[PDB]
Structure formats: C-alpha cells, structure tokens
Design a protein around this ligand. Structure first.
Ligand code: MG
Ligand code: MG
Ligand code: MG
Ligand code: MG
Lengths: 125, 195, 204, 233, 222, 196, 212, 222, 195, 196
C-alpha cells in the first residue's frame, strides 16, 4: 500500500497539509449556522458564476445525516461526500446497536474523529 | 415464531403475526411483535430460527433506512423485496445461513397498488394475493382459495383474516397466543389494537 | 436412560457393639423432578432388614418378591429367616435374572437370633455379595457415602453413638447428590428392640 | 491425526547410585510383521544423555534429526559448547516435552513415548518420560508400552523409592534391566531378542552397548506340556 | 482417532484458616491401571504467596501452572514489582482457562493463599474458568469422597447443638493449622482406601504471612 | 499361529509353534497346538483357542463313538467330521484346522479346513497367520516321498521362518510323527531353530 | 439453576438460587448467580457458569467504557444488546447462557431483558430462567399482581425460588434477593434453604406433602 | 484382580489378592477370590465377580453329585471340562477367568480357563488385570522342582507384584495349598501388608448432634 | 394425551384430564375423556403412547369388573392400584411394553378416606395428596406445594385445580383444549360439566 | 504389486511385476513399475499408482535441479527427497517405494520407504502385497556380494513366487541393472518364470 507520511510536522511545529486544507475551506462557498431558542438554521452561499444549472438534481449543500441531524460544509465538494456517507452509516449503526439515534455531539465527534485520522495516517491527505 | 400471514386486498396489505415466543416447555412471552418497518410504506414480518429472525430483520431495516437517507427517497416494495431476496440468496451458501422466512407487505405510491411478497430462507421470492410461512399455510391457503376476492376492502380482509386465525386456533397443536395485525396502505402503517 | 439413576436414592448400613444400623433417604424423583418425599427404601422380613436403591419399580417388585419368599420359608421351616441365609436368597434371586437384571443396589442388615452377631452385606445388581465388618453403601450418592463412612466410622460404637455416625454419613452424602435427600430414616437394631428415627434435613 | 505404521515396543530404564541405565530392542514392527531388525531406538546426545524412543519409527527418525540439529545449533557462537554450555539432559527433555505438547495441541502428534536418561553437570541423575499427549513424569524406574506393565514391577523390587538409589549399584541395576528385557521377550509379541543398552555414569561417562541378546532362557519345561486339559500323549 | 486428552488421576484439597491456607494433593500419577510415578508433585509455589494445583490431565495442568507462573513474572515486570493479590491471580487464571473455551484445559484448578486483609483464601475453578472463593474445596478423582466430609467437619453442616431440638446450629469457627492438617490427612487416607487412583504419598503446602512451608506423608501404595 | 502338516514316505508329520496371544500379550508361550482326536489322527489348531478346542473335543468324542461301533475311522472320515462342525457353524467359529493321520492302507494323509469349512486334501498344508510368510519357501522346497529326517528339516526350517517374521507365532516348535511305527513327539527350542 | 426477575408497582425484584451441578454431583451450594454491573444494573446467570460469569463481567467493562465515552450511564436496552450481539457472533460454537439484564434508567424506567445464547432478546415484565423455571413460574404467576408492596414482592420472589429449590433437584443452596428502584439496586440478603424451607412451612402452613 | 497358580514337588498352590472394584471405586477390600469346588479342588477367579462365584458354585455342586454317584474323589479335569463347556456355551458373556487347581487320585493339576472357554496347562499361570505384574515375577523366579515353601513364596510374591503395581489389585494375599496325600490348607489373609494407619482424630459425635423429627418402636415379633 | 392431574382433599379425589387428541399438526378431537371407571368408587386417568393408553385402560377395567362379579365385592383402591402396578411392572420387560402412565383416584369405603395413586409406565407406584404425569407437574407441583392444605373441601379442591389449569394455559406451549374434571367420593363418581 | 531391489558385487538390481489393478480387474498387465529419477538412481513403486507417479515426477524434478547446481546426487540424497515427500504428506499418500542407485564410491545401495515415510537402508528390500509371501524364501536365499547372474536368478525366483501366490501381482518380470557399466533393462515372460 501507498504509505507516505504526507501530513508531517515542520520545524515551526505546523502540519502544513492540514493548514493547506484550511485554505481549501477558506476558498469554499460561505456557510453559516445560527441557533434560536427552539430551532437551528443553516444558511449557504451558492456562487453565481454558474447559470444554466439544474437546481432539481445538483447536490444540495445541506445534507440530512439522519432524520433529526443535518450537515453543511465549506471546502472540496467531493471530499464532503465521503464524510457524509460515513456519517450516515454510523448514524444507522448507532440505532442498530444502541436502539437510539445519535446525539448531535456524538455524530460530530465521529466525523471529527474521521478527519483527525486522515491527518496522521500514511498514504492519505 | 411459527405463524405469519399476509393478505393483499384492493387498497392495502394486511400482515398477521403470532405473539408467542416459546423456548422449551415455557411460553416466555405472549405479546411479541414479529415485524419491522423498513420504510413508511413497507412492513416486513418474519419467522424462523431464534435470534436469526430479529438480527436479520433489523439488518435489513438498517440498510433500507440508510438508502432512504442517502437518496431522500423511498424504495418501492418491489425494490425492497428484491434486495431482501438477494441477501437471503447470498446467506444460503454461507458458512452459517440466516434461517429466516419473511413476508413483505408494502404500498407502492407510484402505482397506487398494495403488494405482498413471500420469501423463504433460501431466497425464494413470489408475489401473492395472500401468503403464509410454516405450517400456517396448510390450513389458510385452502380457506383463502375459497373466500378471497381481489376487490375486497380492508374490512373484508380483516374478517377473512379472523376466519384464518379461528381455524388455526381450532386445529393447530400449539397455543400461539393470538396475532398482532398491521395494515399497510397509502397512508402508511398502522396497528389494529383489538383482535 | 441409565435406570439406576432415574429415581435416585441411597441406603447405608453399619455395625456397632451388639447392634446394627440401616438408613435411607426418602426421595423418589423422575430425573430432575422430585415426585415423592415418602418413598422409604428399607423393608423387613421378621428381624432381617433389607434396603434397596435404584430403579423404584424394581425396589417395589423385589420387596414384594422377598416378602413372598420369606413367608413361604417361614411356613415350611417353622422359623424366621436369618440374615446370612437371607443374604444368600437375595444373591440367588438376582443372579437368576443375570442377563435381564433388576437395576438395584440391595443392602442387608440384622442380628442373628441364635449367635447374637451383628450382620451386614451389600449386593451389586447381579447378585455378587459384598460382606463387611464395618459398613455398606448404596445408591446415587454412593461415592459420597463411601467417603463419609471411611472417615467417620469406628468399630464397637454403642447404639446411641452409631445413630449419630450413620445419620451424619447419610445426611452429608445426600446433600452433595441432586437425586438423594428430601427426608431420611434411620433404623437402630438391637437383639430385641428396633428404633426408627426420621431425621430433619434440608429439602432441596 | 495419525496412525502409527512402523513401531518400536518398550523402552525401559532406571536410576542407580551413580547414574542411569536405559534399554530398548532393535525391532521395527509393521503390525504383526517383524519387518526391520537393525533399528537403533536409543539416541545419545553428547556424552551425558541418551534418549530412548518407542512408537512410530518415522516420527522417531524425525526426532533424531531434531536432536542432531539441536547439537549443531548449541555449538554456534558458543566457545563453551563442550564445557559449561554443553547440552544438559534437562534441556534436551524440556525441548522434546515442549514439542510433543505443541504437536498434540495442533491435533497432529508425534506418535511416541520417550524416556530421556542422563546425568546433569552437577552429578544428579536425570530420568523423565514424555509421550504423544505431552504428558510428563519422573520416577526411579520408567518404562513405556508393555515395559510399564512387566518391567516396572521387576525394577521397583530393586528401587521402590528414592532412598533405595544410593544402595543400588550399576552391577545390580544392569542385572535387573537385562532380566526385564528377557521377560519382555517371553511375553511381548512385538519384541525382539536383540537389543541395545546404555549406561550414563557420573564417573565413567557414557557406555553404549550394541548387539546384546537375551540369554539364559527357560524353555525346557515345554516338553512336559501336552494338550490343553485331558490329553496325555 | 487421536484423542488429545488423558486422565492422570490424583486428587487435591484446599482449606482456608483465619491467617493461613493449605493446598494438599497426593503424589500418585496414573494412566489406566498403571502407576507412572509414586512421587510426582502437582501442587506448586507460584510466587507472591500463591500455591496452585491443576488436577486431571497432567499435560494440561503443567501447561497452565507454567503459564500462570509466567503471568506472575510479567505482572512484576509491567507493574513495578507489585505483589499479585490472590483475587487478582484468580481473575487472571479465569482468562487463561476461558481463552481455551473451545479446546479446554482438562483440569480442576485450585489456588490458595492470603487475601489482602491477611485472611486465608481458597479459590477453585472449573475447566473453562468459572471461579469462586471458598473456605473449602476438594478437586479431582476422589473429590466426591472428600467434599461431603469437609462440609461436615470444616463448615459443620448437618451438626446441631445438643439438646436444642435441632433448632440451634453448631457455630462456625476457624480451625487451627494443626486441626486442618488432621482433617487433610484423614481425608486422603479415607480416599486412598476407596479410590484406586489415590495413594502413594501426600504433599501439603501451607501458606502464612511468613511464606510457604511443606509437609509430606506416606500413603498406602496398593 | 504358524502350523503345518506334511505327508512323506513313511507317513505324515504335523508341526506347530507354541504361542497363544491376546493382542500383543503372549498368554501362553508353551502352548500345544497339536491335538489328538484318535491314536493316529491328529490336528493342528489355528484361530480362536476356544473354538478349536471345543471342536477338537467334540470330534474326539465322535471318533471314540465311531470306533466303538465300526472300528478305526479313516483320516477322510475324521476330516469330514471336522468339516461338518466348521461348515454348519461357520457364522460362529474362527477355526483354521489341519487334519493329519496315518492309515496302513492309505499311508499319510493331510486335509486342511479353512474358515468357510471347505475341505482340501493335499500333499502338505500350511495355515495360521505365520503361514503367509512361507508360501514362497514351502512351495520351492517341498518334494513328495521325503524321508523322516528330510521332512523334520523341512518343517523345522519352514516354521523357523514363519516364527521369524510373524510376531503372533513363536516359542518352541512342536512336531508329531505319524507312521506304522507309532507316534513320536518332537520339540525344538529357540537356540536351535533361530540360527538356521 | 432457577432465576427470576419481575417488574411491579415499586420497581424490580430479582431472585436466584445458588446451586451448581456437574451432572448429579452437587458441586457448590454457594454460587453468586447475580452480578452487579453498576449501581443501577444487574445481570442474572443460568446455563454455563463460565460463559455467564465471563461474558457478563465483560459486559460490565463495556458498560463502564460507554459512560466514560458518552458521559452518561448506559441504557438497559443498549447493555442487553451488547451482550446479545456478542453471543450471536458465537452462535453454533456451543455457548450456554440464559440471562436477564435488569435495571432502571430515567429514560426507560425499570426494565428487564431476557438474553440467551441462541441470540434471543426480549423485553418483558416477568421471566423465569433455568432448569427450575417452570416451578418458579407456577408460584410467581398465581400470586403476581402489578400492585404488590415491596415487602410482598420480595417475599414472592424468594418464595418462588424456594418452590423450585424444593422440587427441582438441580436447584437449591440458598436464595439471593435484590430490589431495583429509581435510586438503584438494593441487596436483600442470602437465605439458606436449609432454614428458609422450615421457616416458611411453619409460618405459611404450606408444604404439606412434606413430613413435618 | 491378580490371581496365580504354581506347581511344586508334591502338589499345587494358588493365590489371589482381595480387592473388588466398581469402576475406580473399591467396593470390597477383603473379598475371597479362592473358591472351593470340592475339598481338594480349589479355583481362583478373576473377572465379573458374580459370574466367577456362580459358575464355581454350580460346577462345585455338580461335582459333589458326581462324586457321590461314582463313589470317587472328584478330578480336576472334570471340573475343567464342566467349567469350559459351560463358559464356551455362553460365548464369553459369563465373565469368569479361572485358575483351576487341585489333587485327585491321578496326581496334582494346574489349569486356566478364559471366559470364552479356552483352557491352558502349565507349571505357573496368572490371570486378571494384575497378571502381567505377576507373570513378570513368575518368569523371573520360577524354576522346576520347587518345594512347597518356595512355591508359596513365589505365588504370594507374584500376587504382591499385582497388589503394588496394578490399580485393579490390592489389600491382602489369600493362598490355598493342595498337596498330595494331605488335606488342602486354605490360608485366608496369608499376608496383610495394607493395614490402615491410625486415624488422626475420632469423629464420634456429641450425642444429640443430629436433628430428629420422630421416633417409634418397630415391631419385629408376631 | 399429555395433561392429567389429580388432587386428594378431605373427602374426595379429583382428576382433571386434557381433552385434546393431536396427531401431527392437527387436533383431531377436543372432547376426549381420558379416563375409565374401574369400579363404582375407583377412577383411572391415563396418558401416553397412542392406542396403548385406551387398550391398557380398558384391559384393566375388564379385569376389575370381572373381579367384582366373581366376588360380589368392590376391591379397595389400594388393591386396584397394586394390581395395576404389577401389570405395568410385567409389561416393562415384555417384547413391547405398554407406554402408559396413570393416576388412580378412589374412595375407600372401609376407611372412609379418599386415595390418589400415581403410577408410571415402569410400574412405579406412589400414594400422593396431589399428582401429575408428563410436563404438567413441572408447573403444578410447585403451585400445589404452596396452596394445598390437607383439610380442604371438594370446592376448595376445584378452585385449586382452576389455578393449575390457568397456569398450564398460560405457560404450556400446546393447546390441550381444557380439561374434563371428575370427582370420586363416598357416593361414587360424577363429572363436573362446566369447567 | 511385488517389487524388490538387491545389492550385489557390481552394483544393484531392481525388479518388479507388471500388474495394475482396480479391484480384481487388471487395468494394465504390462505396467512399468521401475522408474528413473536419475541416470543411475531408480525406484520401485508400490501403492497408489497416482501417488507414486506424482512423487517420482516431483523427485526427478528435484534431482535434475540438484544436478544442475551441485552435480550428481548420492543415492542417500535421492532417498531423503522421497522420504521428505512421503513423511510430510503421510496422511494423503499410499506409497511404498524402494529407492536403488549406483555410486562409484558407494557402489550399490538400497533404501526402502514404507507407508509412514520412515527410511531403511538395507542389503536388499522387498515390498508390495506380493512381498508377504516371499519373506521366508528371500531371507533363506539372499547372500551378500552375489554375481549379476546369481542376483538376476534370486530376483527371478523370488518374484516368480510372489506372483504365484499374490493375485494382485502378475504379468512380466521387469528388472533394471545398475552398475559402473551402465543401465540394462531385462524382461522375463510368464512361459519362462512360471515353471521355475
Ligand atoms: Mg432441589
Ligand atoms: Mg494396586
Ligand atoms: Mg491420493
Ligand atoms: Mg498372479
């Protein structure tokens, strides 16, 4: 298997590949989350250099992970699908074994854990 | 386990499933629901080897729920039944096969038709107006051959089912402790509380 | 499907000074199910005492058989059968069924009326005589009885002491066997008085 | 899982005041066929240990190779290979015992019973048994197969407990072993007349005797035995 | 077909005093109707004031004892020479046995020592690792002969206070090491009389806060 | 067992080892497998000791009763009685018997009776577990009309080899000589026959 | 074994015997067939002593890890399901277990799950499990009402194990009693059948089949 | 069992141990395995205990009736023939393995009978589980022309080999000597090398220890 | 067959015996009386191998009726029970044993006491205050251990029996179709029609 | 099968019958059971034809590879390779093989490898079903340092007898002579050997 340590420390203590991943996020369309007294709203910019789009079918920016939890994102779209698919699988696996849907904190911790794992594993960015 | 039936009428599918769970010479439970909702308009009843039954049902349930979330869409009964069959067809040549028989009752919203699928542990699928697994069928199939009509109402279906349960309660050697009855139609899945 | 351990039960016998003792539990079960708490396994024909463990239908049958044979003996001989002689009759009768045997572990106890000697003997299901100065054991807790007796026993115990010894041998053997217990009876036997005592024991 | 094909019968042995004696016949039986007659079943390891093997001969030859290779390995980077770091009987035994139990645990046994006889560097006598199941035990006398039934009773008359060992000479002990070998030849239908014997002594070292024979046998009384009951002539 | 198990006979016995514990076992080793050895010990000092016997199939018993001794060695290496408490030993041994749940060690295992309050402790195990602390336990071939005796003489079962109408039980009390050794010796001589696999010798390991002592007694050799 | 019977010029000689076995244990190392059913009609026994003894005992009874009524029986007659018992009870016997006797009309005769209870009249016969190993030898070395000393040598060498290879066979080599002269018992110990 | 656990007005009763057998050999009269997983969770043991003992203490380790990771005591549903999913992996290998996972949580209330080695998992109000289960059922069922006082409930549980200890040859020794409430579990003693039988006979006037 | 027979100058001697087993349990520690068939024909028996007793008693009975009918002392070959034909008829299902010996008007005789009906003749014989231990001694020490006292020693030594080395054999040595021109001497417990040692403790109980529910006088009279 | 019970109270013996007869997966009959009157004050219930049961019961019935006519007298329950036991004890070592278990309830007129005898197919006899054959006892013995008293009335006995049947109807796996109950007392044998 | 290999003064001779059998049917009456694994290392095959062929084919491959790297292998080496295959796969083989070869240092050598995969170096060796019947004969007639003609006669007579008694053996007698001179194939038809 391809094994290279891609995320590594530099002399100043930074992991440049992680920081460069942040720049990809900074380049992504804006997304915002505001929580009310009795709700949460997720808002998302969609850049307008694209007309002739088909809005029916184009992947929407907010994804349902389970019927009670949603995930939005800024950054590389193709990357986001991988995190969403894993999150959706874990959501069903949690219901199967614990007989209760995920807490938002749990689901977040899982997704966060996946992201961290890709920062100290060989062969991946 | 043992008794699971299904009848498809004009506008709904009705599943009836025995309530007893017996291990040895003891009825451990008389209120067991041998069914899982796979999607809002699809219900699966099941019977077979202890443990295997629920483990399989819940595994299928998890898989269909995952699909629903991923596509924000509900698989047709035909699609679900085909997925289930394939899963069982794999299982039969495994190291340890799932020994579970199932009925899948669903309302297809695109066609506005109810649908009943009978599938045994080998992955043998058939669509039927009425179906059963185990010894049940040896009494009920002949009775439904006689009294069943394709244009029946949900209420006519329930009475037809009451006949089946009456016969089983007369001639079956074991006390299966009555049935839980569920109706699957255009408005989803509901449970008849008095039967 | 092992006939000697379907019903369960035990018998033990001991000699003392000018006395003998024979004891049995009261259980009759069908494997795990206990059924009767009143199934005595010791019988007597005149002054000769016979205990029988094993398949309960054969226990009953053999009692009825030895009553039959000892009654006829008495009518023809014009005297009660002695234990040495009865022991021989038991052996004859079991070996007669050599290839379709009664599934039992009989034990004989008594005091010879002429010589005054105490006497005990045990038998396998096929009639072999096990004679002994000290003690005889039988039943589903026979291993346990062997262990109790072999440590607890000493020769020439007085009737009141022998009672304590045999009762303790039986009770503690019974409590390590699932198929023995549910009551107990002890017979203290002297030349011309016999005392029967029911023991208090655990009922599980 | 196996069945033994070519087999060796009893290995017998005992301790005496200064050392140990061990013996075994030279036969490789093939069922009831007495097929091979030049088979050495005592294998010396160095000048302080003899390993006697019964049971399957194909597995015995495998063990020979293991022991021969063990010697080679012990010599590697070992300046004291013929001195303080020479192979002890206790080392050789624990190795075989380890292998025997591993093989039984993998359901593929070496179909043998083994006795390791020798003298440790401190002068102590070593005698221990191990078999196909990995079962081990020590005793002043040890024998395999028929030997356990017929030799041990004879050898135990000489050494019945630990305290009898200093009182037993090599002359007495060898007499008993040689006598035991005769008895087994009378009575074991898978035995041969020819055998080997080895003495390991804390003073005289290893004496290995080949091509011995059972002698001084009583057969004369056979002529008087007629019929099986009533026959006179 | 190859049968990977055998039966080496023998029998063992653990009794726990107030500030001591004994673990006894005969020294006879058999297969079928033959004696392999009249003195082959099967009760061992494993360190940290823990004695152990694994009775039944000797090859399995030796492997187990070997592995537990080795477990004690690594417990020291990994936990700053900490003493392995008897309760911790028992639990470790459960995992050793249960690790072979589907190809078990054919042994009844007993260990003895002192608990962490200085009180005598005996633990017994079934072949796959079920374990229980007890005042009293016999294991092996003659366990059925010995155990009911110990119920009567150690825990005073079925014994009542004279005159009390069988209403007041004989009161429980600890026994001296002198009394316990008497009960052990009598247990084994009785067992020797009536069980063919039991005989030759008896070797008792006693455990106090001062360490591990031994005592050996002849048993009948027939 | 290794057994054989050999006709020759003056009569017939029977020979046998002396090993009785229960598994690999030798229950008897000095057995006598050459058995008299009449003055000059003998048999060699192989198979189950119990079966062959019970049979020989019955045959001896029959021939004693035959003798009382009709005089001396022929060797053929003796062999027929053996056969009748062996054939009719073939399901419950393990007996391979060689019958050998001396008439004055018929001289030496050998009949062998294997497991099925068939009868086979032959110049010589070999039987028992040890016989397998000397078919080669015996076929190459047997001649008709040998002398007493030649026949004793043939039997001694043959059974020596059978004993050498068959672990079930062993002990001494017993022989019985049947001629007009009478009945002679011979024995040969290991130290002689082993080193032939 | 005989074990039981039932739900009622005032929580959960759990009662077990203490006998262990090797065939007809009574191996022990003093076995602990209840395992305390946490202050609000109990597990009962029937079948293979080792299997139950080993996997139910293992269960406790898994429950402890859950509350470290989720900062919250595990639900009875989830605890029972860890054990049942574990045994289902071993299905066919020959594990022998009849267990009941009993406990209270805020979200569930008092809850009992029957879990066995064929992989069966059932929520329920009453279960008896073991070789003496039928005997325990007979008494328990005939005297059971939801409204029983804690005092009467404890006795019924104890009396039901007694019934089975008496009739079932493979049950006995002593009874171990537990009560589980909103505040957790409470132990209610070890009761030797030696004395309990005679005490109950006298005080209750039952067991007339027995020579008094 | 271990049993033996040894011929000497002027007769024959037989011996046996006194252990009886049920599996690994010792049922009888002092059972008599030397059986009288007639006054000067005795039989040592191994195998199924009831079978050896019954078959020995039955033939013993028929020998007595024969002796009376013929007005002659019974011969060993008669007992041998009657025993073997009986046992053969039963195809081994009567598990009696017998060493038959005695003196009669014809001389002194020694035979063995297996269960199955096969007979052997010899100067020294052994049967039973301990027969190999015994035979090892006999093969080591037997010679032609033994005296009575030498034969007894050899025989009892052969039984001892069984007692010590075979788990199927133990306790005592019984001997019977049948010399020509003399009464047979049955030497019951000729050796007793397995006397139980003094117990450490008396277990005699305080009177009243045992809880009692009822008493009653039992009537044994008419 | 399967369920047969018996309770002896102060002044009567009560036998309860299931009504179902099942062969395969079919209940052929739900009104079967598993009992024979042996004499006016002796009743025998029975369960076991199909065919054997009735054949045995009727054979015993014929024998006791013959005795009654010959002696113009009624055998005591003890005498009848001993005759029955011996017949079964013979049977067990026959070529083909009767596989029948029985309860014998009788009122002994000479002693004015009710008597209940339980005898299995091996000829194992016991006199009991209450008895059962088959799996029945695994539920009822514990329950009767608790609620039974020796001085109960016939009516208390019937209520105690209703408890037993209720428990069996709750926990038994098979539908035994209720029981026929019969009372044996000083006035003979009568049947309770509503149970 | 009947097979044997015999060392003598000038080298070694291998011999074999030619019968291959499936039950009582002779699948091949002219089989060649003498098989070359090297110029002057040959073997006699007995047991399963498939097993022994597969084995010989593997051994020939090994010795060809040995030869390419280290020169000519010894007969001991060839026998060791046979053993390794037979021993390590003892559960799945029915092969009784005799290995025979000619060195110039070691002259003629014979190693026999029975079912277990043990190795036995011998002056001569016999194997196969037919060998049982000639143990007697061969032990009595074998001498060391025989001439070529004497050895050919010993083998011819021996296998003649094995064939006479063993129904599994038969056909022709093939031999292979291994000396310094080279390799010689001999054959002997029934009409010759039957009437020896
Ligand atoms: Mg109980
Ligand atoms: Mg012994
Ligand atoms: Mg193959
Ligand atoms: Mg041919």
């Amino acid at each position: 298997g391809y094994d290279r340590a891609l995320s590594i420390f530099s002399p100043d203590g930074h992991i440049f590949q992680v920081e460069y991943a942040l720049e990809a996020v900074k380049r992504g369309t804006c997304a915002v989350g505001v929580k009310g007294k009795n709700c949460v709203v997720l808002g998302c910019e969609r850049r307008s250099t694209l007309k002739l789009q088909d809005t029916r079918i184009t992947p929407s920016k907010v994804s349902k992970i389970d019927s009670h939890v949603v995930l939005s994102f800024s950054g590389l779209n193709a990357d986001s699908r991988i995190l969403i698919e894993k999150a959706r699988v874990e959501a069903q696996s949690h219901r199967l074994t614990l007989e209760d849907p995920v807490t938002v904190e749990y689901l977040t911790r899982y997704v966060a854990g996946v992201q961290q794992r890709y920062t100290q594993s060989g062969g991946v960015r | 386990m043992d008794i699971i039936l299904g009848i498809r009428v004009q506008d709904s599918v009705i599943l009836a499933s025995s309530k007893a769970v017996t291990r040895g010479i003891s009825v451990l439970k008389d209120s067991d629901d041998k069914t899982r909702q796979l999607s809002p308009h699809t219900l699966m009843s099941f019977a077979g080897e202890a443990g295997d039954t629920v483990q399989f049902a819940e595994y299928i349930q998890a898989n269909i729920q995952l699909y629903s979330i991923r596509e924000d869409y509900e698989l047709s009964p035909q699609a679900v039944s085909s997925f289930v069959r394939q899963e069982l067809a794999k299982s039969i040549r495994s190291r340890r096969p799932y020994q579970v028989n199932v009925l899948i009752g669903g309302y297809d919203k695109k066609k506005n038709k109810p649908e009943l699928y009978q599938i045994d542990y080998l992955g043998t699928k058939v669509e039927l107006p009425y179906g059963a697994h185990g010894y049940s069928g040896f009494y009920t199939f002949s009775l439904l051959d006689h009294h069943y009509r394709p244009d029946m109402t949900t209420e006519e279906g329930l009475d037809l089912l009451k006949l089946c349960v009456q016969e089983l309660e007369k001639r079956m050697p074991m006390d299966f402790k009555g049935v839980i009855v569920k109706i699957v139609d255009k408005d989803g899945i509901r449970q008849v509380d008095d039967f | 499907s092992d006939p000697s351990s379907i019903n369960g039960g035990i018998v033990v016998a001991m000699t003392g000074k000018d006395c003998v003792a024979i004891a049995c539990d009261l259980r009759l079960g069908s494997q795990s199910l206990g059924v009767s708490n009143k199934f005595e396994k010791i019988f007597h024909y005149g002054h000769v005492f016979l205990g029988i463990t094993g398949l309960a239908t054969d226990v009953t049958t053999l009692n009825e058989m030895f009553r039959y044979k000892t009654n006829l003996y008495k009518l023809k001989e014009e005297r009660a059968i002695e234990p040495e002689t009865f022991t021989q009759l038991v052996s004859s009768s079991l070996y007669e069924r050599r290839f379709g045997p009664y599934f039992v572990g009989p034990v004989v106890a008594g005091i010879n009326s002429k010589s005054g000697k105490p006497f005990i003997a045990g038998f396998d299901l096929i009639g072999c005589i096990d004679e002994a100065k000290d003690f005889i054991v039988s039943g589903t807790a026979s291993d346990q009885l062997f262990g109790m007796c072999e440590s607890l026993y000493e020769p020439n115990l007085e009737p009141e002491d022998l009672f304590e010894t045999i009762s303790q041998a039986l009770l503690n053997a019974a409590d390590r066997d699932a198929l023995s217990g549910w009551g107990a009876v002890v017979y203290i036997i002297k030349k011309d008085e016999v005392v029967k005592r029911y023991l208090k024991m655990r009922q599980d | 899982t196996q069945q033994p094909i070519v087999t060796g019968t009893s290995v017998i042995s005992m301790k005496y005041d200064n050392g140990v004696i061990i013996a075994a016949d030279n036969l490789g039986s093939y069922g009831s066929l007495l097929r091979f007659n030049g088979v050495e079943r005592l294998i010396p390891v160095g000048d302080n240990t003899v390993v006697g093997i019964s049971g399957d001969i194909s597995d015995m030859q495998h063990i020979e190779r293991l022991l021969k290779d063990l010697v080679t390995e012990n010599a590697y980077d070992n300046p004291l290979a013929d001195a303080e770091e020479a192979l002890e009987p206790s080392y050789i035994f624990e190795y075989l015992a380890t292998v025997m139990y591993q093989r039984r645990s993998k359901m593929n046994p070496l179909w043998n019973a083994i006795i390791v006889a020798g003298v440790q560097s401190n002068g102590d006598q070593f005698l221990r048994y191990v078999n196909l199941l990995g079962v081990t035990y020590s005793s002043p006398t040890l024998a395999t197969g028929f030997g356990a039934h017929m030799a041990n009773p004879l050898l135990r008359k000489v050494v019945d407990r630990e305290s009898d060992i200093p009182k037993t000479t090599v002359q007495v002990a060898e007499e008993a072993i040689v006598n035991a070998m005769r008895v087994l030849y009378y009575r074991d239908a898978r035995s041969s007349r020819n055998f080997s014997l080895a003495i390991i002594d804390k003073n005289t070292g290893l004496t290995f005797k080949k091509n011995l024979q059972v002698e001084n046998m009583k057969w004369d009384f056979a002529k008087d035995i007629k019929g099986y009951g009533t026959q006179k002539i | 077909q190859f049968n990977p198990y055998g039966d080496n006979g023998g029998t063992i016995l653990g009794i726990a005093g107030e500030d001591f514990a004994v673990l006894a076992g005969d020294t006879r080793n058999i297969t079928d109707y033959s004696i392999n050895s009249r003195y082959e010990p099967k009760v061992f000092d494993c360190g940290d004031n823990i004695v152990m016997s694994a009775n039944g199939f000797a090859a399995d018993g030796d492997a187990l004892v070997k592995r537990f001794k080795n477990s004690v060695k690594w417990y020291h290496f990994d936990h700053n020479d900490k003493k392995l408490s008897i309760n911790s030993a028992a639990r470790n041994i459960q995992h050793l046995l249960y690790g072979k749940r589907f190809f078990p060690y054919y042994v009844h295992t007993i260990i003895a020592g002192l608990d962490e309050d200085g009180k005598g402790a005996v633990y017994s195990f079934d072949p796959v690792g079920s374990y229980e602390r007890e005042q009293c336990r016999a294991g092996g071939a003659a366990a059925s002969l010995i155990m009911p005796f110990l119920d009567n003489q150690v825990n005073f079962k079925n014994q009542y206070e004279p005159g009390t109408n069988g209403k007041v039980k004989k009161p429980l009390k600890y026994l001296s090491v002198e009394e316990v050794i008497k009960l052990v010796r009598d247990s084994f001589t009785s067992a020797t009389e009536r069980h063919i696999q039991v005989g030759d010798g008896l070797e008792i390991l006693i455990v106090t806060k001062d360490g591990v002592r031994k005592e050996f007694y002849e048993l009948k050799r027939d | 067992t290794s057994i054989m019977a050999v006709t020759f010029k003056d009569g017939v000689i029977l020979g046998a080892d002396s090993r009785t076995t229960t598994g690999a244990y030798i229950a008897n190392r000095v057995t006598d497998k050459l058995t008299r059913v009449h003055d000059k009609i003998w048999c060699c026994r192989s198979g189950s000791a119990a079966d062959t003894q019970a049979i020989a005992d019955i045959v001896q009874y029959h021939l004693e009763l035959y003798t009382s009524q009709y005089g001396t029986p022929s060797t053929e007659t003796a062999a027929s009685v053996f056969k009748e018992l062996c054939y009719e009870n073939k399901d419950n016997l393990t007996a391979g018997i060689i019958v050998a006797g001396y008439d004055d009309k018929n001289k030496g005769e050998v009949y062998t009776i294997p497991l099925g209870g068939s009868v086979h009249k032959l110049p010589y016969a070999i039987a028992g577990s040890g016989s397998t190993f000397i078919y080669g030898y015996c076929d190459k070395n047997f001649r008709e009309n040998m002398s007493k000393e030649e026949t004793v040598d043939f039997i001694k060498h043959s059974l020596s080899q059978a004993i050498k290879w068959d672990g079930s066979s062993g002990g001494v080599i017993r022989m019985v000589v049947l001629t007009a002269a009478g009945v002679e018992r011979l024995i040969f110990y290991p130290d002689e026959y082993e080193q032939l | 074994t005989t074990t039981l656990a039932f739900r009622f007005q005032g929580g959960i009763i759990v009662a077990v015997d203490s006998r262990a057998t090797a065939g007809n050999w009574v191996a022990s009269q003093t076995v602990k067939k209840v395992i305390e997983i946490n202050p609000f969770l109990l597990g009962t043991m029937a079948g293979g002593a080792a299997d139950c003992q080993f996997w139910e203490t293992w269960l406790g380790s898994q429950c402890r890890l859950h509350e470290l990771r989720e900062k919250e005591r595990i639900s009875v549903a989830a605890a029972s399901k860890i054990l049942s999913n574990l045994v289902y992996q071993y299905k066919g290998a020959g594990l022998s277990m009849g267990t009941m996972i009993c406990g209270y949580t805020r979200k569930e209330g008092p809850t009992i799950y029957y879990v066995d080695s064929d992989g069966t998992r059932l929520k329920g109000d009453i279960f008896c499990v073991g070789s003496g289960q039928t005997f325990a059922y007979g008494v328990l069922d005939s005297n059971y009402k939801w409204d029983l006082s804690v005092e009467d409930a404890l006795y019924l549980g104890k009396r039901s194990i007694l019934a089975a200890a008496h009739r079932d040859a493979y049950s006995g020794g002593s009874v171990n009693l537990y009560h589980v409430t909103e505040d957790g579990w409470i132990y209610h003693g070890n009761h030797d059948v030696g004395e309990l039988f005679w005490k109950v006979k006298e005080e209750e006037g039952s067991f007339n089949n027995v020579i008094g | 069992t271990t049993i033996v027979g040894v011929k000497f100058n002027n007769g024959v001697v037989i011996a046996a141990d006194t252990r009886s087993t049920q599996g690994p349990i010792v049922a009888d520690k002092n059972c008599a395995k030397l059986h009288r068939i007639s006054p000067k024909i005795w039989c040592a028996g191994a195998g199924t205990a009831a079978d050896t007793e019954a078959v020995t008693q039955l033939i013993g009975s028929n020998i007595e009736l024969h002796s009376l009918y013929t007005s002659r002392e019974p011969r060993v070959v008669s007992a041998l023939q009657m025993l073997k034909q009986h046992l053969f008829k039963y195809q081994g299902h009567i598990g009696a393995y017998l060493i038959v010996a005695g003196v009669d008007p014809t001389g002194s005789h020694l035979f063995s009978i297996h269960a199955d009906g096969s007979t052997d003749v010899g100067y020294y014989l052994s049967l039973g589980s301990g027969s190999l231990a015994a035979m090892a001694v006999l093969e080591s020490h037997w010679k032609q022309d033994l005296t009575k006292e030498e034969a007894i020693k050899l025989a009892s030594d052969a039984i001892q080999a069984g007692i010590w080395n075979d788990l199927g054999s133990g306790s005592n040595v019984d001997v019977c000597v049948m010399e020509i021109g003399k009464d047979a001497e049955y030497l019951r417990n000729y050796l007793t090398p397995n006397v139980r040692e003094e117990k450490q403790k008396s277990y005699k109980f305080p009177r009243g220890t045992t809880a009692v529910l009822k008493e009653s006088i039992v009537n044994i009279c008419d």
